[PDB]
Write a protein that binds this ligand. Structure first.
Ligand SMILES: *C[C@H]1C(=O)[C@]23[C@H](O)[C@H]1CC[C@H]2[C@@]12CO[C@]3(O)[C@@H](O)[C@@H]1C(C)(C)CC[C@@H]2O
Ligand SMILES: *C[C@H]1C(=O)[C@]23[C@H](O)[C@H]1CC[C@H]2[C@@]12CO[C@]3(O)[C@@H](O)[C@@H]1C(C)(C)CC[C@@H]2O
Lengths: 301, 301
């Protein structure tokens, strides 16, 4: 028994976090080999943020206007460029703590860990999901901008996220490590509203599989259903449609539990139409959608 | 906005995790300076666990019967002793990655991060609370025994927990780093049932303060109450009694929000007697008790 939202161990990323200052603005950067990555709005004043012309603003910056601090060591900047919405600062020292790594752009619904940092210093780690509307429900006060999200496979860190903005709703928007935003958001202080935040159906089903593996079976019901009939119900409840790809990703969990995916869909259906009547699943009074099928296999096999 | 259960960055502890084998039993150990700490039941066979005589079982073990592996480096054991329920293995090398650290014994209700490990390898990090019945609702399959729980203050790791057992209920029991169990549990495969798992009232109140800080105010009601009158209600709902010490620990949150502790207690009361009628607080459909007052200050000031 025992199922926890778990984040990845953060040590490999802790060794890459640095502080980046340009003028009076400071935020977090990511130091890998001899490049530091950070949000380009590090070059903006609070007044620039309303309508930045990043090209024009960057023209007025030289290598020596970028202060990069790694602990107490200060790094010498020998070059700078803009890639989409990320600033790349070339430094004269390769990070000795650079882990094996790749830059990946994740899909909505996939999960990752964020190492929340302030002024280059790691403060906390938590697990979250890329919401279907490409927002992240983070924990970030002023100063965590530039914090990164990642997954770890064996000894390789896949960086998938860099926090750039807090929207007026308080939710977060960011980019991949090539500087391309997830979703329609931009690095400007302007009206930016996110679409409907739907529930990640394939993740909810994975979590129901984890509940069964852990002894929570009360919601296991006696009906089955069809993919079209289920999506009919899912659409009404602002759940993402389930595809056959999702059914196939759930394959290993159906095999471990002997519960067919459509049977699980019919129990989910009943839960969406009836509620939980005051009972809990895995200690939660709502359906949880920040576990992917792989996360469940990771923690339940 | 934004409030997440956050764990501490784990890197300082990742550098201390090792694998400890005695005969055919392997588990996680903690390498600090030139001592490795691990559950003494590493010396037990599956059959020894029903009624171990640890003194007699340890007599039959020499330094060379303890295999300690740190990554691919194997450490030379030059001594061994038993301290309560923890085995201490003296090795000939001080861990170069030893962080500043202390051993502390925490109170029920306090929180800490667990770095779940398997065979010496970090696999995940999560935040939890010492339950008032001295259990931990962990995520630990066979092999995570010896995983440790910790808090970090600046650059100092306070180790407070070592996972030793899974009880028949699936919940976890462990020791502090001096080898003394939290609660009445013992390192033996026998009937062991935990007491009532009450809710940590002072933590629930801290979390309600975090909700107010984050804009969730619907539960803020118009009543007040008294400490005796509140504990009357808390006892009925298997909530821990609130003391004046708890009121004083909540002092900074009452000051930040302008909401008197007894006012918050009266809103909690109303929630315990009425439920939440289907609405949520900070995205949760139940009251959350794994945030201490300090955790909330950490993430909300
Ligand atoms: C790093 C982000 C952040 O903290 C910002 C923005 O969302 C983004 C860059 C600029 C930051 C602000 C504007 O809104 C923020 O949410 C906010 O935290 C910052 C304040 C505190 C308002 C100061 C100005 C700055 O431009
Ligand atoms: C490390 C713990 C663990 O995994 C144990 C016990 O709770 C404790 C030491 C011994 C382990 C067992 C007995 O119960 C466990 O929960 C279980 O995981 C172990 C099995 C798999 C049953 C094998 C025997 C061993 O003694």
């Amino acid at each position: 028994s025992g199922f926890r939202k778990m984040a990845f161990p953060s040590g490999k990323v802790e060794g890459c976090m640095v502080q980046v200052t340009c003028g009076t603005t400071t935020l977090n950067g990511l130091w890998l080999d001899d490049v530091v990555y950070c949000p380009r709005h590090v070059i903006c004043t609070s007044e620039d943020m309303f309508n930045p012309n990043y090209e024009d603003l960057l023209i007025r910056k030289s290598n020596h206007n970028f202060l990069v601090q790694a602990g107490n060591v200060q790094l010498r900047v020998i070059g700078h460029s803009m890639q989409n919405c990320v600033l790349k600062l070339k430094v004269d020292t390769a990070n000795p703590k650079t882990p094996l790594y790749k830059f990946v752009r994740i899909q909505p619904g996939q999960t990752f860990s964020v190492l929340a940092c302030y002024n280059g210093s790691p403060s906390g780690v938590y697990q979250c999901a890329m919401r279907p509307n490409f927002t992240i429900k983070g924990s970030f006060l002023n100063g965590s901008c530039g914090s990164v999200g990642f997954n770890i496979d064996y000894d390789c860190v896949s960086f998938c996220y860099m926090h750039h903005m807090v929207l007026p709703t308080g939710v977060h928007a960011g980019t991949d490590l090539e500087g391309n935003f997830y979703g329609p958001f931009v690095d400007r202080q302007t009206a930016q509203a996110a679409g409907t935040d739907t529930t990640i159906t394939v993740n909810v089903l994975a979590w129901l599989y984890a509940a069964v593996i852990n002894g929570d079976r009360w919601f296991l019901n006696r009906f089955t259903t069809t993919l079209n009939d289920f999506n009919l119900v899912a659409m009404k409840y602002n759940y993402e449609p389930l595809t056959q790809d999702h059914v196939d990703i759930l394959g290993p969990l159906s095999a471990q539990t002997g519960i067919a995916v459509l049977d699980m869909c019919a129990s989910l259906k009943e839960l969406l139409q009836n509620g939980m009547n005051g009972r809990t699943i895995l200690g939660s009074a709502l359906l949880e959608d920040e576990f992917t099928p792989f996360d469940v296999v990771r923690q339940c096999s």
